[PDB]
Design a protein around this ligand. Structure first.
Ligand SMILES: *Cc1c(COP(=O)(O)O)cnc(C)c1O
Ligand SMILES: *Cc1c(COP(=O)(O)O)cnc(C)c1O
Lengths: 405, 405
C-alpha cells in the first residue's frame, strides 16, 4: 500500500494488525480462506467508479463496454467451471443470491423445506430472525440421530406432508456428501423446485471432489468466497429457462448497481479455479480434512457422522464434558481459531453448543499438509484435555507458533 | 497492479480499458464519482479474508479485534460527519440500506408514501418491478407541474388519505433542496415514520451545503458512493431508539457477513469527508452545477425547476424536439456521458424520456471549474442543436478531448 498509510494512519494500522493476525493464527473456521494477490488487486481497481445496473449489452447507462467484458468473463468462466446453462454474478453475497432465488419462485407465506438449522442448515434457510423465516413458511428435515447423515426418508415425508413450493438442500455444517439426485427425486414427487446452496462446497464441486448439483437443481446458489477461494460475494447458477426471471430478481428486483470491481475479482478467482493447480489444492483440502479427522479420533475425540467427506468436520465434545463455547475460548488463547457449532440433537442452546466446527481450506491455502494436520490434532488434544493447565496452554502456544513459523 | 497482469491478462486488459475510458470521457452521470487511491487500497486489502458477522465486540466468530477497530472508525466518523446517534455501515448497497429500514418498520403489504418515480423517486421507492413495490403498498406524491418543486400539500393530502406507516423522502433526479422539516411535520400529523434516502446528496449534506435530514428523520439511508465520494456500498443512520432493531434488520435480518474491506474504505472516505478540502470540493460541485445550469440556459435549454440547488440538473428537451434517448446517444458519440431521464409529467415512456440528467460531482473531482462548465454547456449546445451534422460532432469530439487534455 502506498497512499493509505499517509492518508489514514488509523485505518492503515488496523489493517496491518489484521494482516499480521491472519499470518500468526491457525485459521480453522470452515468458511474462511485466503484470496490471491490478483483477486485483491482486482477489488482495489477503478471499477468501483462505474455504475453498471442492468446486464452486459443491456445496461441502463453508457460507458459500460469494458465492464461488460469483465462481467462476461466471470459468467462464461463460471459456466465452464460448473457446467451451468446460466450464471448471474451480481449477488452482493450468498444471502442476496438466496434472497433472489426466493424472490423468483415464492410468494410471501409460501412453504419451503430446508435442512434443520441445528443439524447443519444455514441462517438463510428459514431462521425465524432472518428474512427467510419471516417472509416464508419454513419446515425442516433432519439427520439420523446416530449416523448424522441426512435422513432422506424424512426429507420425503416432510415434503409429502407439507407440500413445499421449494426444497432447499445444502449446509454450513454438514461433513458428508449430499445426494442431490435424491433431493431432485423428492422435489419431482411433490412438484417442488429444488434449490441447492453449495456455498461451503463450491470449490470442491469445481474440482470434481463433490458431486455437482447443477444437473439436479433448478437453482444453485453459492458464495464466491469459502472453498472456491474467491472475493467476498454471491452467485446464482440456473437452467436457461429461469435465466431471465433470475436476472430480473437480482436487478431491478432486489439489488441496485452491481460491484463491478468485485465481479472482476470473481472472474479472476474463476480463472484460478479452472487451472490444474486449483484442483490439486482442492484435493489437498479434502485429504487434509480426512487426515485431521482421523488424527482427532486418535486423540480420543468423537466426530459428528464419524468423520468427513469434504473440507469440514464437527467435534462432538460431550465425551470431554465441554461446551463448544469453552473449547472455542481456550483454543483462541493458544492461537487456533475455531467456532462453537451446534451438533445434531444438541442438548445445549446455539449460543453455548456441544461442538466445534473445523475446516481445512484456509490452512491448506497456506501450504499445510498431512504432517501439519497430525500436529494440529495433537495440539487440540493437548489443549482440550488440559483446560486448567497454563503449562499445557503455553506449550500449545509455542507449537502453534512453530506451525505458522 | 503487479500480480493481476500476469495471472489474468484478459481481466487486466479490460480493467485497463476502463481506467483509460474514465480519463478520456466527460462523466456527467449524476450518480458517478472517482474515489481516492487510499479508498481503493483499502478495498484491495486482506480484510476480504475475514468473516465478521455480528457487530464490533459482539461478533459470531473470534479474531475480529482489528476489523472491530475498522468498523468503529467507520461508525464514529459517520456519526461526526452527520450528527447521527447511530450508524450501521454494513449495508452492501443503497438498495440493502433501504431494504433493511423497510424490514425494520413494515409488515408485508403496509402502505408507504414516496416520491413519484417519474418526478425523481428512486427504484427502491416502490417500483412495481422492485421488491419495495412488490412487498409493500406504495403510494406517490408529486411535484408541481410548473415549478417542478415537491408539492408539500400533495404530500400531506396523500399521507392523510392513504395513512402510510412510512413516508420516504429523497430522490435520484430532484434538482432542488428538500424540506425535511415539512416532511417530518406531515409524518407527525398522520403518525408515520419518516425515512430520508439522501444517497444523491449525502456529500453535500456532509459539507453543510444541503440541510441535514438527521434531526428530522427516524431513519436516514444513503449510498457511501455518489456525492460522498466513497466506495460502492450502503449506510443507515438512525436515532438511538431504533439502533438495535436496525442492527438486527441488517444482520441476521437481511445480510450475512459484511464486506470488511469495503467497510475499511468507507472509514477512509468518511475521514476524507471530515477534512476541510472535501468541504471546498463540495462547494465547487454545487458552484459548478449552478454555473453549468446557467450556461445551458444561455444555450437556449429549458431546465426542470428552472435550475438547481444541488449537484444535478435535468434538461427538458421538448423545445428542441428531442428525446432523452436521442440526446444520450449523440452525446455518447462525442465522449460526453449522460443518461436519459424522465422529466416530471413526461409525455414519453421511461425508456425514451424527454430529458437528460446531468451532475457535476465527477468532473469537479477531476478538477473542472467554472470555465469548464461554460465549455461543456457550449459543447452540449453545439451537439444537440446540430444532431445531423458530422462536422459539428467532430468539432465537439475535439473540444471534449481538449478538456480531458
Ligand atoms: C456462508 C453461507 C451463506 C452466506 O453468504 P454471505 O456472503 O455471508 O451472505 C449462505 N449460505 C451458506 C450455505 C453459507 O455457507
Ligand atoms: C443510487 C441510489 C440508490 C441505490 O444504491 P445501490 O448502491 O445502487 O443499490 C438508492 N436510493 C437512491 C436515492 C439512490 O440514488
Amino acid at each position: 500500500m502506498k497512499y493509505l498509510p499517509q492518508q489514514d494512519p488509523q485505518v492503515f494500522a488496523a489493517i496491518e494488525q489484521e494482516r499480521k493476525r491472519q499470518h500468526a493464527k491457525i485459521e480453522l473456521i470452515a468458511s474462511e480462506n485466503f484470496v490471491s494477490r490478483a483477486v485483491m488487486e482486482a477489488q482495489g481497481s477503478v471499477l468501483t467508479n462505474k455504475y453498471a445496473q442492468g446486464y452486459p449489452g443491456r445496461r441502463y447507462y453508457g460507458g459500460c463496454e469494458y465492464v461488460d467484458i469483465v462481467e462476461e468473463l466471470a459468467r462464461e468462466r463460471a459456466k465452464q467451471l460448473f457446467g451451468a446453462e446460466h450464471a448471474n454474478v451480481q449477488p452482493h453475497s450468498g444471502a442476496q443470491a438466496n434472497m433472489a432465488v426466493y424472490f423468483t419462485v415464492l410468494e410471501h407465506g409460501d412453504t419451503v423445506l430446508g435442512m434443520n438449522l441445528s443439524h447443519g442448515g444455514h441462517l438463510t434457510h428459514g431462521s425465524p430472525v432472518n428474512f427467510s423465516g419471516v417472509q416464508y413458511n419454513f419446515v425442516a428435515y433432519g439427520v439420523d440421530p446416530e449416523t448424522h447423515v441426512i435422513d432422506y426418508d424424512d426429507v420425503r415425508e416432510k415434503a409429502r406432508l407439507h407440500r413445499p413450493k421449494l426444497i432447499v438442500a445444502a449446509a454450513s455444517a454438514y461433513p458428508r456428501i449430499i445426494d442431490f439426485a435424491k433431493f431432485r427425486e423428492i422435489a419431482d414427487e411433490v412438484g417442488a423446485y429444488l434449490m441447492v446452496d453449495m456455498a461451503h462446497i463450491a470449490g470442491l464441486v469445481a474440482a470434481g471432489l463433490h458431486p455437482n448439483p447443477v444437473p439436479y437443481a433448478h437453482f444453485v446458489t453459492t458464495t464466491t468466497h469459502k472453498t472456491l477461494r474467491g472475493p467476498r460475494g454471491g452467485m446464482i447458477l440456473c437452467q436457461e429457462q429461469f435465466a431471465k426471471q433470475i436476472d430480473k430478481a437480482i436487478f431491478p428486483g432486489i439489488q441496485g448497481g452491481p460491484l463491478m470491481h468485485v465481479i472482476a475479482a470473481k472472474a479472476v478467482a474463476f480463472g484460478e479455479a479452472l487451472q490444474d493447480d486449483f484442483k490439486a489444492y482442492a484435493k489437498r483440502v479434502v485429504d487434509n480434512a480426512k487426515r485431521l479427522a482421523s488424527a482427532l479420533q486418535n486423540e480420543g475425540f468423537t466426530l459428528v457422522s464419524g468423520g468427513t467427506d469434504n473440507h469440514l468436520l464437527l467435534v462432538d465434545l460431550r465425551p470431554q464434558q465441554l461446551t463448544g463455547k469453552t473449547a472455542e475460548k481456550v483454543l483462541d488463547e493458544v492461537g487456533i481459531t475455531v467456532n462453537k457449532n451446534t451438533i445434531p440433537y444438541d442438548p445445549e442452546s446455539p449460543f453455548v453448543t456441544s461442538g466445534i466446527r473445523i475446516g481445512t481450506a484456509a490452512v491448506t491455502t497456506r501450504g499445510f499438509g498431512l504432517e501439519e494436520m497430525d500436529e494440529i490434532a495433537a495440539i487440540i488434544g493437548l489443549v482440550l484435555k488440559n483446560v486448567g493447565s497454563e503449562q499445557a496452554l503455553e506449550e500449545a502456544r509455542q507449537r502453534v507458533a512453530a506451525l505458522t513459523d
